C-alpha cells in the first residue's frame, strides 16, 4: 500500500504555504505497512502538471491526498468535486492567468472526489478538529490538480482513491494582514497536519 | 506586585469557556516575583458585579486584566475602549436581558483601557500571535466587567491598570456549529492562554 | 422565441422568497417579441422535478433561466456549473434532507450552464449591478433544478439554454436577522428583478 | 428648526462618496416647517474640524446628522458613541494618518449621540430598511467628526441633538471590487437616502 501527499509552494506573495511543510513532514512515513509520500508542486498551470503527472507514474499509490491553502477558510474543507475548467482570480507562479479553458478538452466536466469524504470529516470532528465538506476547490491550481488526478484514476485505473484537502492559513501567516485592513481566519499547522494524517489513515482503512 | 487575571464561566448554550481554564490555568503562577491571582466570574449582571468588587478588594491587584470569550472573532483582540451602557442582545446566565441602562448611573461615558495596548499587541505579533485592538468590547457581560474595572481604578486608585481581552472560540467548539450552518474561526487553547501570559508579562514591565 | 424563468417558494423558515415574485412579475411579459413564461417551483424534493419536467415539456422553452435565493451571497450570482448529487444541509419543504444520492443515476457529474454567463454578468455591470460567476449553486433545490434543467437539454434538444442564477435577501428579510446575531447582505427586489430581465435579454440576443 | 446634515468627500482611492450626494440631495428641502441644510466636509483631520466649526456656527442648527460611508458594512448603522482619540488605519485625503492622539485634549473620553437612536432604527425598521446601532464609529474621519459635533453640543449649547450615520458601499462601487478579490455588501443610494431622511424626521419629531 502506497500513498501519495502532495502540497504546494508559496503563491501569491505569501512567504509560506503551510502545505509545502505537510508534505515534507509526511514524506517518508508509515501508517501500519502503508507507505507514504509526501511531494511538493509548483503553483504553476502545466509544470504542476507535469510535475503531478510523472509523481504518479512514478510511484503509481494507491491513494493520493492533494492538499492546498484555501486563504480565508476557517475550517478544514474536503473537496467534493473537481471541475474540468481553468478561471485564476490571479496568475500562477509565473504570471499565467488562464480564463474560461477546460482542463483536459473532451474529457467530463466533472469528477467526484473517489476519498471517503463523509468518513473523514466525522473522523475529524472526533478529534475536535473542525472540518467540513467544500463544493468548489476553485479554478485555480488546486482544482487543477485535484482534477488531473481524478482524471488519471478514471483514465489508467490508479490511483484507486484521490481527493483534495484545503487547510486555513496558520497564525503566522495573519500577522502581516493585521495591519492590512481585516483578520482572515486561521488553524494551527499542528492541526492541519493531523488533520492530512487522519485523512490518509481514514482511506487506507477504507481500503479493505 | 499582584495582577489579578479573570475569566468567565460557560453561556449562551456553550458546554465551555475557554476564559474560565485560562483563568484556573494561570492562578497561583509567579512571574518574576509578581503573583497572579485568577478568578472565574459569572456571566449574570449584578452578581458578576458583587463577585468582581468583593474580589478586587480582597486582592488589591495593581493590575487587573479580564479574560473573555468572543465567538466569530480571528484573532485575540485587545479592548480599547469601555462604556457605560448595558444593551444585551441575549439575556445571562440568569435570563436577564437588560436594555438601554448605564453601567454606573453619572459616571463617565466611557474608559480607556489602561493596560499597554499597543505594546501587547506588538508582542504578540513577535509572538507570531494574531492579535488586533478591538474598538468596542460589545454591551454585554466583557464591557460591564471591563467599565466596572476601570471605574475601580479612576475612583480607588487601584488597579493602576486595567483592560480586557477577548479570545476566539477554541477549536473543539466548533464541532457542533459545523451541521448547524457556519464554521466559525477558532484558535487554540494554547494560543489563548499564552497571549494572556504575554500581556500579562508586557503589563508588568510597563510598571516600571 | 419562448422563455421560462422560474422561482421558488419560500423555504426554510423564511416567510417569502423574492425569486418567486420575480418568477410572478416576469410571467406574461415579452422582450421583441419573445414570449416569457414565469413558474414558480415548490422546494420540495421529487416533487420539484414532476414540476419542472410539467412545464418543460408543456411550454418548450428555448431558454431557462431559474432563479433561487442565496441566504448570505452579497451580489446577483451566476451559477457556472449544476452536479450531479443532493447533499441538503437543511430539509426541504416537506422535511426530506437527503444526503449523498445523485440526481439522475448513470447521468454525467455535471453539466456546465448552457447561458452566456459572462456576457450577462459584464451587461449587469454595465447596469451598475454587482454580480459574479458562482462555481457551486450548493447541493439543495437551486442545484437539483439547474441539473434536470441542463440533463432535459442534453437529452430532449430544448432548452437550447439553461442556467441558473441566485439572488441576495431582499431588505424586508433582513429585519429579523438583526436581534438574532448577524446581519447578512442584501439587494433591492428591483435589482434582482432587473438582473434578471437584463440575463433573458443576453440570452436571447445570443440566440442570433 | 434647522437641521444640518453632512457628508464626506470621497476618499480611500473611491470614485465616489454616496454621502456626498445625500447631503447635496438633501440640502434645501424641507420637512414640515423645519429647513434642512446639506453640507459636504472633506476626509482630511484639521481641515474637516475647519469646515464642521464654521458651518456649525453659520447656521447654528438644533439637530446635525452625520453621514459617512462604512464600506464592508451591510445595512444602516446609527453610531451610539463617539470616542475622543484618532488613530487611522489609512492617511487622510492629504496624506496624514495621525495615530494615538486625542481629538480634544483634556475633553471627555467620549460622548454618547443625542439623536434618539433606538427609535430611529424602529422607524427604519418599520420602512423595510435594515438598520443596526454601532457601538464604534472607527477612529477615522466619521469618529473624528462625530466627536466634535457633540462636544459642541455639550460646550455651546447647539445642536441640540447630534448623531452619526453611516451608509453601506451603493452597487456600482462594487463592481470593480469583483476581480479584485471579494465581494462586500451594499445598499441602493435610494434607501440609503431614505434612511437619512427617515432619522431626521424621527429626531424632528422627538424634539417636541
Redesign the interface.
Known amino acids: 500500500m502506497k500513498v501519495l501527499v502532495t502540497g504546494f509552494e508559496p503563491f501569491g506573495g505569501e512567504k509560506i504555504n503551510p502545505t509545502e511543510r505537510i508534505a515534507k513532514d509526511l514524506d517518508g512515513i508509515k501508517i501500519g505497512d502503508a507507505q507514504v509520500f509526501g511531494r511538493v508542486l509548483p503553483v504553476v498551470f502545466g509544470k504542476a502538471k507535469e510535475v503531478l503527472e510523472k509523481t504518479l507514474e512514478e510511484i503509481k499509490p494507491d491513494i493520493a491526498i492533494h492538499v492546498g491553502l484555501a486563504p480565508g477558510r476557517?475550517?478544514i474543507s474536503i473537496e467534493?468535486?473537481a471541475?474540468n475548467?481553468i478561471?485564476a482570480?490571479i496568475p500562477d507562479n509565473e504570471g499565467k492567468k488562464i480564463e474560461?479553458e477546460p482542463i483536459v478538452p473532451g474529457a467530463?466536466?466533472?469528477?467526484?472526489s473517489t476519498l471517503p469524504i463523509?468518513k473523514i470529516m466525522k473522523k475529524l470532528?472526533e478529534r475536535?478538529?473542525?472540518?467540513?465538506?467544500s463544493?468548489?476547490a476553485?479554478?485555480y491550481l488546486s482544482n487543477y490538480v485535484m482534477y488531473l488526478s481524478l482524471h488519471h484514476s478514471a483514465t489508467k485505473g490508479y490511483p484507486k482513491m484521490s481527493g483534495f484537502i484545503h487547510v486555513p492559513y496558520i497564525?503566522?501567516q495573519?500577522?502581516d494582514?493585521?495591519g492590512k485592513?481585516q483578520?482572515?481566519?486561521?488553524?494551527?499547522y499542528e492541526?492541519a497536519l493531523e488533520a492530512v494524517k487522519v485523512a490518509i489513515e481514514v482511506a487506507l482503512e477504507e481500503l479493505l
Chains 1, 2, 3, 4 share one sequence.
Open positions: 476557517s475550517a467534493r468535486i471541475v475548467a478561471d482570480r474560461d467530463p466536466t466533472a469528477y467526484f463523509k470532528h475536535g478538529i473542525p472540518a467540513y465538506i463544493n468548489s476553485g479554478l497564525p503566522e495573519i500577522i494582514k493585521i485592513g483578520v482572515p481566519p486561521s488553524m494551527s492541526m
